[PDB]
Design a protein around this ligand. Sequence first.
Ligand SMILES: [Zn+2]
Lengths: 113, 50, 86, 100
Amino acid sequence: SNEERVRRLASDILNCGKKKLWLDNNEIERLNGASTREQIKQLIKDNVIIMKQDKHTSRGRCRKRLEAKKKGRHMGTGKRFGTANARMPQKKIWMKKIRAMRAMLKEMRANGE
Amino acid sequence: GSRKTALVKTRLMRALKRNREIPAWKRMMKEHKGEYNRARRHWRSKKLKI
Amino acid sequence: SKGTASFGKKNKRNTEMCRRCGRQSYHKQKNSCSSCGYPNPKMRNPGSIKARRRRTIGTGRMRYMKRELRAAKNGHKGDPILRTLW
Amino acid sequence: MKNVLIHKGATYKTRSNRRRKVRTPSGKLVNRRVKKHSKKHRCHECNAILGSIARMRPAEFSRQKVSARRVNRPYGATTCGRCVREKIISAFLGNEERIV
RNA sequence: UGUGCGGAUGGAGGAGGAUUCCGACAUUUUGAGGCUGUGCAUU
RNA sequence: CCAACAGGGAACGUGAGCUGGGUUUAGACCGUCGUGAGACAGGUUAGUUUUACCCUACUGUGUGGACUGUGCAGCAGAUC
RNA sequence: AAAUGCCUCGUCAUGUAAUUAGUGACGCGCAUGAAUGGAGCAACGAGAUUCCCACUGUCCCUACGGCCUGUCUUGUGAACC
RNA sequence: CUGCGUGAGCGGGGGUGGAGGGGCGAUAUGUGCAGAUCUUGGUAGCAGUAACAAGGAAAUGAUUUGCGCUGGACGAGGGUUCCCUGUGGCAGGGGUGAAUCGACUGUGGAUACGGAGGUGCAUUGAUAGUUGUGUGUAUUGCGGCUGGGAGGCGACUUGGCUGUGACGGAUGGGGGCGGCCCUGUCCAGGAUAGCAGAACUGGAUGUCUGCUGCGGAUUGUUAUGAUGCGAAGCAGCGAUGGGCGAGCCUGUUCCGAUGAAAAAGAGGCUGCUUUGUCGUACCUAGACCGCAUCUGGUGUCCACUGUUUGCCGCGGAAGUGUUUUGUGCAAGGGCCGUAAGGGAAGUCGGCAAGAUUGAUGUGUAACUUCGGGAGAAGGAUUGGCUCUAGCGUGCUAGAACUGUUUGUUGUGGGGAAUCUGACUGUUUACUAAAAACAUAGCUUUGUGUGUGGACGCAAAGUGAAUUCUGC
RNA sequence: GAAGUGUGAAAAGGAGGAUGAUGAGAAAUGAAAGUGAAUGGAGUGAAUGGGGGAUGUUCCCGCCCGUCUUGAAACACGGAC
RNA sequence: UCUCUGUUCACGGGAUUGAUUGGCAUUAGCGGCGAUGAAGGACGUGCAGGAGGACGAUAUGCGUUGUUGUUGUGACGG
Ligand SMILES: [Zn+2]
């Protein structure tokens, strides 16, 4: 059989895994006799060799759970496992509050108030 | 490994072209029948020591 | 774990091939051959009674000393051309 | 054989082996070599910055024109403009106390 | 074991011109659906 | 509590049945003794439990109908 | 009567239905005792001990169920004695 | 097979075998075996037994479907195991290309420290920062032409020299290579009984650390601050779609510890010419070491996603590995699950198992070196859905409704006493982890000089503090 | 720091089997331990031995050798062939 | 059939008998290496070649001289 030489050359040309390749079962005499990289590229244009598709996991039921808790849906006392500081650090709420009220004072002074 | 000294490389080459059986035209002679080289080495069993 | 498990750590090599005698016994950190004693000008005293008969006069080729012995049976006549000068 | 990083040479993370990641125009991901980091020039007296001299390693530095390697005034390669004024005033005022 | 799918009538409230859309769950059709190695009959 | 809570033997029955608390080499503490290395049937604490697939014994099982007789072997109820 | 007390399961009190265990007190102490260190426990300990709550197949007294072995087949095929 | 001899032994007959073999006297001896846990070689019983293997399938198997989790690169070690052809594992013939990869050069040392020089795209059966090609950088030698000054109050601009190499730990703020997520638009892909405001997947597009002049008293940080030794401000110089951070920029802090050395400086615009030697195939564990296709050991780098404080656990991708005619389950084992009523009666001994467990309000004693003890102990709440409030827009607080009562589908058992060691640490590689050893503190002794000069250097004992240390 | 010498006078020839050829001869000789096939006899008693008789047995006698020891069949040691 | 024991043929193993270009001893002579680069080591050399032996880029051997017609060989020199 020539199966082992065709999956090693075709997997390098197409840059995929050896199991994602489909070899036409009804053209065993074209598949037996390739032997070069230039002949493997002709069978890829003639659809004697085809590349399967990957699984990409869907995010549809993960996007529904993210817009539900933007309304506050899965955040009660039974759903928290880190501490209050781990999931919203207190030093970073302090920085955000005094940079905003140091900015008002700078423009209340520039307007004469 | 890929890295090796020049003296290590030329002794590995000599050891390589030694590991060979008696040629066929010599075994076919009348007075050399039933002779095999018998000084053969296989890389898993016996080690060369550099 | 001083048995089987300690053997998996032994991948450093201390020696190399000696340029005087050809054994794997030239210690690189010591700068010294443990077989022949290189780089001392004299060769090392052998370590056993059998060691004396593994490397001596006659265990190699004797490329020059054989020739000289054939010349001393005939009185050391040399090349017939140069014999006029002598 | 999807999704690999291409890396050439040794892998130890020293000062002289820093790498970035880049996507090449054919879709590959490569761990590429970055020049060795060179520091800013300072004054040798007050430790202020001399922001105009180039930041290069010593061999590439020496291949530049003199306008890249110094400032145009005395001590221009090592000293600050503020420390040179005081050094001139101090030299002149000293000679006036010795001719008196 | 415990009242099936689908439909119909409701639902704390919210959204906004259509008298529309979103909504856990409720009542009804319905001791209802699913399952069985035991017994009887038949093919 | 009970009718009553007798005494003994079987390689001081029974570790290829178990367990390892006593005893228990190599670590350590205290008291007394010794110039010392060390000692004590004086006290204290920490300290590997190997192998049956052979012969015999014993338990079943196999060693070619149906209905029965009669020899041998086993043997059960006890107490309030 | 302590990791140091022979006599010794010392004597009295306390915890139990019942205490050669534990803790408190006593002291002519075979043979306690002051850098051979004495007295002393805040904090720390996979160190040694005794008791309480909680909890349970540890036990009264065992039952039923799962997977891999064993039981049965083919191949490869040792050892102790 | 047969005769003779008390015996040690000696004769004859028939097959086999295919070249030598004896009697008698004296003489020379490495001169006679059942044993020595005798030496070397061969062979039985045990026994077709113990042990190991039989991996999910589909008459076919380049096609369809089911399961497992290491996957990809550099060094040490190995050395042709790499590719093609023929053949039942061998046999025959091929394959490793360098100014810009490493070393041959520095330092009393080096394939990780110092150091003249690059990035894309394509290409073989097997090599590629090495072959080919688009563009760049350095270098060997040989030429041609050309300048020693102009500017700016200043910071500085220019063919216009004497600079660098060259240096520790912890931690905050700013800003981000690549990857991943949310979002507008445009072009495509795969599955579908029925329904779905029109889902799911891929690709393409969508400024100030500093310095100078004027000025002449205020000004700023997450934090410590800055300023008549010249603040702010104005004008310059120089430097450089939204959100989750690596190198980078800028601070603070810690030490009886303060964080190597040497090689390697010159430079304008142009034309020709040069670039030595050795390594380069293949394998992270069935290509290494452990006698082996051995559940052990072996330096460095990169690696997606749901849930979550968590790169853990509990589940998924990518890449990679894998078979297709043994049985169906006695007793007894190894690893586990559930149990009426009782609740340590078991046992040397609660050994083993069970039990507590995340987060947020509440409530916390004796003692104490005032720091601790402390998450002491003890009690309560927790899902889904639909809304309200705050500002910093993802977290925090509040309310109604709802179910076969129930929500952490993970994460400490606690308390009262005695003995002992102060504490974090260290130990009998392969039966002892400790009360042993170390330790700070405390005390004693010697010594006027070693490169070292008494707050030094060396030798002993005791073992934190507190209170003491008698004759 | 080992273990391993032999077809024949002549290659006149073989090397899965069978049928054959060459040669004086299928080819150095080929013991014991142990095994397979056929065929005769015996057995359900550990076996084996001596006397006396007989084509197996029937009566009598008979514990396993070597060694050290006052003393061995020894629950004394060495000994599968 | 199985266990023990006669007989005949076939296995298994390598003792025995007979050989031997090897070993061991005594005796007579000799005791002949190197800066004019030794002994020893590494790597190479055949049209078709691995081990051993032989040989050194004049490499599976060259020149002179003797004996040969041969797979040729002896003695000496390079
Ligand atoms: Zn040597």
